[PDB]
Amino acid sequence: GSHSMRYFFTSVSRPGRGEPRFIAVGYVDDTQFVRFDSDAASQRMEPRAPWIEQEGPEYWDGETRKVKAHSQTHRVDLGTLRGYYNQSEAGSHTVQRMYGCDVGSDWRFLRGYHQYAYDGKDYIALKEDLRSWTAADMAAQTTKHKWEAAHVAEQLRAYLEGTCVEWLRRYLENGKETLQRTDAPKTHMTHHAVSDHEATLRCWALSFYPAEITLTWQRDGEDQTQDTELVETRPAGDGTFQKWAAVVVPSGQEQRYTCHVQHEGLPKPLTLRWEP
Amino acid sequence: MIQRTPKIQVYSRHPAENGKSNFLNCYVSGFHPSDIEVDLLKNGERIEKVEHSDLSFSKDWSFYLLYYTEFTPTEKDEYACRVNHVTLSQPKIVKWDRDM
Amino acid sequence: LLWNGPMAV
Incomplete structure (x- = not known):
């Protein structure tokens, strides 16, 4: 590179x-x-x-x-x-x-x-x-x-x-x-219910280098920034970087959402989907 | 003259686990001018043994700094970062949320 | 390695 x-x-x-x-x-x-x-x-x-x-x-x-x-x-x-x-x-x-x-x-x-x-x-x-x-x-x-x-x-x-x-x-x-x-991001998703009708999905990327990364949420394969929230990429203090991206979704519809991770360290972009 | 107010994130280096040594980070970014006061707080009292990164800046010329301290999370203890800057009418205190 | 030639504005 x-x-x-x-x-x-x-x-x-x-x-x-x-x-x-x-x-x-x-x-x-x-x-x-x-x-x-x-x-x-x-x-x-x-x-x-x-x-x-x-x-x-x-x-x-x-x-x-x-x-x-x-x-x-x-x-x-x-x-x-x-x-x-x-x-x-x-x-x-x-x-x-x-x-x-x-x-x-x-x-x-x-x-x-x-x-x-x-x-x-x-x-x-x-x-x-x-x-x-x-x-x-x-x-x-x-x-x-x-x-x-x-x-x-x-x-x-x-x-x-x-x-x-x-x-x-x-x-x-x-x-x-x-x-x-290059240190590929270690990725995972968390799920937190907000109520009987909504939940938060959060996609995490940790321990990555270099700092450049793209995290994006899609719903039914369409880019989604409504009801999304992204933090600035931040230093861990050990020479690696961290980032997360979140979306609020209807309860029961978690599987319609995917988190897409792009990083120089990945041979192909990752797609993550919440599996209960 | 330009003034830009800081963005602040308070987080740990590694996932938090009670009784396990870790680092608490206060990352301040997007600010101008460069004069900024950053303290880490434990149960409201300033922590002395805090290190910081060398001042640098982003593509839009805004500054960023990482402040950090070695700590051991416990059940009882609350942490926060206190930031003061010319753009703030009073210092901003951001609590450490242990899952974020 | 640093540049050796900065010039005043």
């Missing part, structure tokens, strides 16, 4: 309270492998997966230098953006940045991306061709012109199509025993 490496950065200003909070996290697919947090003790990039722990001091020293450079850029950016929008000094503002790359089943480059947000909305993004920018508004146009003059897209594309995919592949091989594995 395909894979990705993504880095997520958040920077938050602190009016009257000094330096901004900065948090960086790196992921291979849905598995975190590194972090940096300005509030933490080490002030270094730190490992969060077993397979990255084998990288040597040159890796850790280098990643710490680079993540601190990201932090310094964001500190400048919070001041610059406050200027561009003429915002007061009283308010906290947020910058977010995400970049990374995807590879296909042959582990060859498929796509790359870099997105930047200010106060929770798109500010500037790299286009799919990796050669030009989309600016959200007139202030972001200033940034686009600066970045064109400094040929940012060219060097960012070199990273996204080169270094990013080369290091993703290294990680996939070193972490093979856990990163190139």
Whole structure:
């Protein structure tokens, strides 16, 4: 299957309270492998997966230098953006940045991306061709012109199509025993009577990886979202995920309903039906 | 400026069984800005030994965090998660329902 | 591995 490496950065200003909070996290697919947090003790990039722990001091020293450079850029950016929008000094503002790359089943480059947000909305993004920018508004146009003059897209594309995919592949091989594995959902259904005339059916998917999953209820083979209820997919805390979907049905009609589960870990989609 | 109020789920890592060690999770998601107060509660009193995940965000830029604690469910004990955020007129307390 | 070249906005 395909894979990705993504880095997520958040920077938050602190009016009257000094330096901004900065948090960086790196992921291979849905598995975190590194972090940096300005509030933490080490002030270094730190490992969060077993397979990255084998990288040597040159890796850790280098990643710490680079993540601190990201932090310094964001500190400048919070001041610059406050200027561009003429915002007061009283308010906290947020910058977010995400970049990374995807590879296909042959582990060859498929796509790359870099997105930047200010106060929770798109500010500037790299286009799919990796050669030009989309600016959200007139202030972001200033940034686009600066970045064109400094040929940012060219060097960012070199990273996204080169270094990013080369290091993703290294990680996939070193972490093979856990990163190139899929955990199919463990599924089951529960039944709870509500009254003499209605009952709840709940379809559960547990212990699955990666996080992407579709749970759908059908009645007589027709998609059913009336009288349905779906929770957001949620982390178990052990590196797997959980989800459930429920429907209220007439008593005696439970067998007209089916729960349909789709997941990369399943050789075919599952259909579940309540059997008393 | 955008503000988004948090969604909250309170659940256990494994199916709950009295006297068996487990983890209690409070997953908070879909919120902005990032400043958020999350406490896990036992019989109304805050639990100190709670860990949390590193702040990250979704495709729409909204934030998510997992708070969690090692615990042993018993007959008598009630748990909840208390969340405060700028979008809430008062803190939200969500009870742990042991089958959900 | 991180990008080495972020540029101020």
